[PDB]
């Protein structure tokens, strides 16, 4: 189950995958904890997501060398906020090569973050554009549309039963879709449903903000995200 590991905690959720979470105090609402992932192709290790910040990433690091041993080839970060950008330094230095949304690049100055290396685009029909993903090994990239935020991006991982929905999915029990400050109310819906039918096959929807659940958490998300229009 969880492995503690300092103040991060660490969980196998398959052969070579693994679900980082980390922790940001939040005074009067409370300690957040955050989901990312680390998966093992072959003889390296992809990181989806840092944690909120360089320390506790650099803590993933320290722990993917205690676990795994094996180079960390890049990092993907799911969309241009702390929870999911907050460490890009602590990657940087460790020479990782950090991938992103281009809109997210774009946006990270003002919202405080370090930009990635390279920028991610995607085609129309949401796939990212192979050239700029290069050698993602099974990692699927599909950008679902606006939901929680405009730059939002998803991850599957081929081989597995496994896609991660970063912070546009909530869990099939969650009493609302949260912070709304930066999202898209029209399109949240449509997303979260784009984001379902990229990974069709995916029985174990990986997540920001709860543990891995079903697919119900994409359809609850969804009709919750339907009273948004
Ligand atoms: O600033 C924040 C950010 C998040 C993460 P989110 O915006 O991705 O949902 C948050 C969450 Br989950 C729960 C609470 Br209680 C307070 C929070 N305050
Ligand atoms: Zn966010
Ligand atoms: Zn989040």
Same mark, same amino acid.
């Given at each position: 189950?969880?492995?503690?590991?300092?103040?991060?905690?660490?969980?196998?959720? &398959?052969? %070579?995958? !693994?679900?980082?979470?980390?922790?940001?105090?939040?005074? +009067?609402?409370?300690? $957040?904890?955050?989901? @990312?992932?680390?998966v093992?192709?072959?003889?390296?290790?992809?990181?989806?997501?840092?944690?909120?910040?360089?320390?506790?990433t650099?803590?993933?690091?320290n722990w993917?060398?205690?676990?795994?041993?094996?180079?960390?080839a890049?990092?993907?970060?799911?969309?241009?906020?702390?929870?999911?950008?907050?460490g890009?330094?602590a990657?940087?230095?460790?020479?990782?090569?950090?991938?992103?949304?281009?809109?997210?690049?774009?946006?990270?100055?003002?919202?405080?973050?370090?930009?990635?290396?390279?920028?991610?685009?995607? &085609?129309? %029909?949401? !796939?990212?554009?192979?050239?700029?993903?290069?050698?993602? +090994?099974?990692?699927? $990239?599909?950008?679902? @549309?606006?939901?929680?935020?405009?730059?939002?991006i998803?991850?599957?991982?081929?081989?597995?039963?496994?896609?991660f929905?970063?912070?546009?999915?909530?869990?099939?029990?969650?009493?609302?879709?949260?912070?709304?400050?930066?999202?898209?109310?029209?399109?949240?819906?449509?997303?979260?449903?784009?984001?379902?039918?990229?990974?069709?096959?995916?029985?174990?929807?990986?997540?920001?903000?709860?543990?891995?659940?079903?697919?119900?958490?994409?359809?609850?998300?969804?009709?919750?995200?339907?009273?948004?229009?």
């Amino acid at each position: 189950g969880d492995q503690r590991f300092g103040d991060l905690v660490f969980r196998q959720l &398959a052969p %070579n995958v !693994w679900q980082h979470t980390s922790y940001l105090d939040m005074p +009067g609402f409370g300690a $957040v904890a955050s989901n @990312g992932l680390i998966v093992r192709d072959g003889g390296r290790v992809l990181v989806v997501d840092t944690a909120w910040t360089d320390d506790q990433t650099a803590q993933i690091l320290n722990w993917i060398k205690q676990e795994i041993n094996l180079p960390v080839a890049l990092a993907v970060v799911t969309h241009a906020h702390q929870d999911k950008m907050g460490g890009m330094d602590a990657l940087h230095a460790a020479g990782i090569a950090t991938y992103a949304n281009a809109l997210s690049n774009q946006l990270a100055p003002q919202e405080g973050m370090v930009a990635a290396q390279h920028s991610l685009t995607f &085609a129309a %029909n949401g !796939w990212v554009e192979p050239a700029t993903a290069p050698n993602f +090994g099974p990692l699927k $990239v599909f950008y679902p @549309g606006p939901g929680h935020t405009s730059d939002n991006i998803t991850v599957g991982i081929n081989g597995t039963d496994i896609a991660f929905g970063g912070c546009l999915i909530k869990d099939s029990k969650a009493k609302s879709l949260g912070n709304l400050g930066d999202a898209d109310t029209e399109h949240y819906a449509a997303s979260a449903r784009a984001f379902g039918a990229a990974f069709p096959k995916a029985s174990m929807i990986v997540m920001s903000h709860s543990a891995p659940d079903s697919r119900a958490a994409i359809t609850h998300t969804a009709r919750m995200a339907d009273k948004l229009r």
